[PDB]
Symmetry: C3
Subunit: 205 residues, 3 copies
Amino acid sequence: MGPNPMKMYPIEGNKSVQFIKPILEKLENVEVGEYSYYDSKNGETFDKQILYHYPILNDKLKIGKFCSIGPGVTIIMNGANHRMDGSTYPFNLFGNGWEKHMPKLDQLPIKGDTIIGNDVWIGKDVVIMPGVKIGDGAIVAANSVVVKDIAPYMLAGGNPANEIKQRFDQDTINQLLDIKWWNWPIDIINENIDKILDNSIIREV
Amino acid sequence: MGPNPMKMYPIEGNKSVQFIKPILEKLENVEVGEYSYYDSKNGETFDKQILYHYPILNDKLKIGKFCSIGPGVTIIMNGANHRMDGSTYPFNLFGNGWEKHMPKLDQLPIKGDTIIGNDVWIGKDVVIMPGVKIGDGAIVAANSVVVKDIAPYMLAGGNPANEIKQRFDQDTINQLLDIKWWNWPIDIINENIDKILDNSIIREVI
Amino acid sequence: MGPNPMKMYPIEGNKSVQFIKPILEKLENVEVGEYSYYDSKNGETFDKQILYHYPILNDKLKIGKFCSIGPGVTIIMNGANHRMDGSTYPFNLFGNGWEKHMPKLDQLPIKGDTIIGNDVWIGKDVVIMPGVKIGDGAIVAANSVVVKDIAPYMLAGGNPANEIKQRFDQDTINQLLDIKWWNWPIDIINENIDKILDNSIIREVI
Ligand SMILES: CC(C)(COP(=O)(O)OP(=O)(O)OC[C@H]1O[C@@H](n2cnc3c(N)ncnc32)[C@H](O)[C@@H]1OP(=O)(O)O)[C@@H](O)C(=O)NCCC(=O)NCCS
Ligand SMILES: CC(C)(COP(=O)(O)OP(=O)(O)OC[C@H]1O[C@@H](n2cnc3c(N)ncnc32)[C@H](O)[C@@H]1OP(=O)(O)O)[C@@H](O)C(=O)NCCC(=O)NCCS
Ligand SMILES: CC(C)(COP(=O)(O)OP(=O)(O)OC[C@H]1O[C@@H](n2cnc3c(N)ncnc32)[C@H](O)[C@@H]1OP(=O)(O)O)[C@@H](O)C(=O)NCCC(=O)NCCS
Ligand SMILES: CC1=C\[C@@H](O)CC(=O)Cc2nc(co2)C(=O)N2CCC=C2C(=O)O[C@H](C(C)C)[C@H](C)/C=C/C(=O)NC\C=C\1
Ligand SMILES: CC1=C\[C@@H](O)CC(=O)Cc2nc(co2)C(=O)N2CCC=C2C(=O)O[C@H](C(C)C)[C@H](C)/C=C/C(=O)NC\C=C\1
């Protein structure tokens, strides 16, 4: 029961809602959770939203399961940073003799891998800077800019985005991070969607 | 004297500046003030700048009189909010048996109506979140994100927008709030446009 | 050795990266340095990114040399400033009698010129408010909105953008601001690019 997680478009006739995984699997070094979807803004496919992601730099993007990514969300990788121990001007780029100044890989600043946990809701037009971590169950307010990590089950917002308040009491969260319903076999999840939607799965589990 | 507040396009040979009232009047759960306008970005009508407004939720949007709204301003209503007492994943949206998990109207988080006062100036590309109130005479800097209310005649900006400074001293602000010139017939407004534009209208009516 | 700063499209078979000087030189009240470029976001040339620049208000826009300008960066000049000694409604704008109230040059808030230094790297989709001054060698994070001045070799970001941290010790900064390699003839810069890329030109030149 439920939709086929391998379709690009789970809702027949609808080219707006699209599962991210079947779209991004072809991409080298990008990991995606099963039911994570993207609400297209103007019809585009999520791959257009990941920028400056180059193999040779080897940074990775990670997206957990059951994530709801709003339209316009932009994930920027490390291929946009410039060398900064000196001038930020990209001399090597204009050639005509300047290539000699190409930078060695260990010279480029690479923050790290980007990792978005499970059951995460990212509002529209959110921009995610390189090498950031977003915990399970977190909520990011529309039009936010994430320059730093976000703890699990936290509501954050702003530019730069900051944690505003815990979604639930530590108690609940600890048990929630404990149960990990996103990891259960779908058929078990199919029988508890109700308890998962109102958090009562904590007492059953 | 002055433009016809019922015309979509007041300025002649200029399909960019439009009077909001005419455009949004056919709409439900929406009230707009007399002379408030919108400076189109790419020639789009202001109605396309109001997102996620479903009558079913019954949230209302109110805009006062004499408001200057920059291009790109986006008004987000309550239709996009996700149920959040548990998992924020919209299972009901994907059918195949998940259809039965549709939320209950009183299970969706509603933030209230969006109310924008009179004589408000909204810079360009501002995004206004659900259930916000911006008092009269306020100025919201460009590219701001309004998440909480803004007091009258205050200058606000940023993401999340914050009140930066009062435009005038308490006394004056109290005064203007009380006076409420935007609520005068036009013959009078038309005759004191210059005192409205320099704030002396206070000394007159006091 | 290196491209001719006078070429519009310096790199070849590339209509996205452009040298600003040649393009903006043909503009009133704009001063652009030599190697500074702009990485187009969709083909659009940089002049389309400068908004509300009316010669009548006489505000100027200056931009140093060797600046890396990311795609979508926007510059906002004083042409969008509403009068605010009182009401902010552009009555004059609508005519039909209201024109009498056109504001006097000395009544509009002109915050001054906008000055961007040399060796300045501005991230993508950054918005620059009017009357701002960014320092030599500063880095402005992508998606920021610059409302106040930014110091040399300072890093900054956010909406509003705030200085986040210095790029090097005071000493080093003091020197580079003294040496100003960006004002040297290219023939010379050409044989130090390496010492300029790792900051060692401070031990040589001094
Ligand atoms: C974040 C959001 C869910 C609201 O959270 P919520 O549970 O309703 O909580 P509240 O609105 O009451 O927010 C509480 C506080 O956070 C602040 N806040 C809300 N959004 C904020 C933001 N982006 N940045 C900073 N603070 C923010 C409020 O101003 C408030 O301040 P206070 O506690 O000091 O008084 C909503 O603003 C949002 O972003 N929705 C997403 C819309 C979207 O993009 N949908 C597309 C996908 S379908
Ligand atoms: C808001 C605005 C009017 C400036 O207000 P102002 O009276 O000139 O204010 P100032 O320039 O003196 O700035 C005052 C303070 O607010 C801050 N400020 C200005 N814009 C800000 C913003 N968006 N967020 C946070 N702070 C901001 C300044 O940093 C400054 O700090 P300080 O008090 O420590 O000195 C202008 O920035 C603006 O938004 N114009 C709108 C342009 C537009 O989009 N027009 C289209 C419609 S016609
Ligand atoms: C700004 C940038 C260079 C990062 O700064 P950095 O030297 O790597 O510094 P770090 O992020 O490691 O740390 C600096 C601090 O600033 C914060 N920070 C980063 N970006 C920020 C922003 N926009 N606003 C506020 N703080 C920011 C970090 O969270 C960090 O917090 P801390 O002081 O508590 O540790 C990078 O985010 C950036 O903007 N790159 C430009 C990308 C682009 O658009 N390129 C197009 C040109 S071709
Ligand atoms: C973002 C940036 C410049 C942009 O402002 C200009 C453009 O958008 C246009 C563009 N840039 C390019 C092709 O068109 C281009 O070719 N770029 C863009 C990204 C990497 C390389 C490049 O050389 O990477 C080489 C590898 C090919 C070996 C090495 C790793 C160096 C990269 C380097 O110094 N990065 C700093 C970033 C400079
Ligand atoms: C940004 C803004 C209003 C915008 O919301 C309206 C528009 O974008 C569309 C538009 N604006 C105009 C013609 O269409 C127009 O004519 N504008 C745009 C910019 C100046 C004048 C204007 O009045 O110029 C006259 C000169 C011709 C003498 C004087 C100098 C005063 C103008 C005044 O109060 N400026 C403040 C700006 C208010």
